[PDB]
Amino acid sequence: PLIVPYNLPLPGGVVPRMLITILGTVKPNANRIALDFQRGNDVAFHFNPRFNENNRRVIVCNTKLDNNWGREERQSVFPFESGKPFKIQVLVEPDHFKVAVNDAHLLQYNHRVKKLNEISKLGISGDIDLTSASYTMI
Ligand SMILES: OC[C@H]1O[C@@H](O[C@H]2[C@H](O)[C@@H](O)[C@H](O)O[C@@H]2CO)[C@H](O)[C@@H](O)[C@H]1O
């Protein structure tokens, strides 16, 4: 097991063909999960499942630049379930991050932050038991 919040260094940043895999279990009465791909203080890609936003489950994605959040991208497919084990895969592609959950494609997020090789940490936080977090090149 891992302690949350967990920091996964991404040496030399991200690059197309880099695949991040996160394994964990959602706690019983979870409120949120967050993945934060950071470029220094900026958040290049924030991926944030919300279990109870006005009694709806939604995933919010965004970018934080100079401490300011940008325009959220939201879609409503919500594959997580409180209490259950999950796998998140984030594949870096030339134009976007591509996210699959439990082997099913979920969403893609276009690169707003262009300096991919400066996106050198992934923070994993929220209401999870975190089993593992790693990367490989495909
Ligand atoms: O955009 C990601 C960012 O959202 C913040 O929450 C927003 C919320 O989504 C929006 O509906 C409301 O109008 O403004 C809030 C503050 O920007 C979260 O606080 C932050 O953690 C990120 O998840």
Q: Annotated binding residues for a beta-D-galactoside, as ranges?
A: 69-75
Residue 95 CB–ligand 1 contact under 6 Å: no
**SS3 call for 131:** strand
Using alpha carbons, select from 135, 98, 122, 106 the residue that is nearest to residue 18. 135
Resolution in A: 0.9
Separation of CA 49 and ligand 1 centre (Å): 12
Instruction: State the structure-solving technique.
Output: X-ray
Residue 60 CB–ligand 1 contact under 6 Å: yes
How many CB atoms neighbour CB 111 within 10 A? 18
63 close to 70: Cβ distance less than 8 angstroms: yes
The preferred substitution site among 36, 67, 69 for testing ligand 1, maximizing ligand atoms within 8 Å of CB, is 69
Which atom of ligand 1 is least distant from the CA of 70?
A: 1
Q: Which amino acid is at 51?
A: F
Cβ neighbours of residue 35 closer than 8 Å, sequence gap 6 or more? 22, 45, 46, 47, 48, 88, 90, 122, 123, 124
Residue 56 CB–ligand 1 contact under 6 Å: no
Q: Is 11 exposed, middle or buried (0-12, 13-18, 19+ CB in 10 A)?
A: exposed
For residues 126, 21, 121, 31, the Cα torsion angle rounded to the nearest 10 degrees is -10
Q: Which amino acid is at 134?
A: S
Peptide bond into 5 cis (omega under 30): yes
Handedness of CA 93, 66, 118, 128 (dihedral sign): negative
Domains along the chain? 1-138 (2.60.120.200)
Using alpha carbons, select from 28, 81, 84, 31 the residue that is nearest to residue 54. 31
User: What are phi and psi for residue 89, nearest 5 degrees?
Assistant: -120, 130
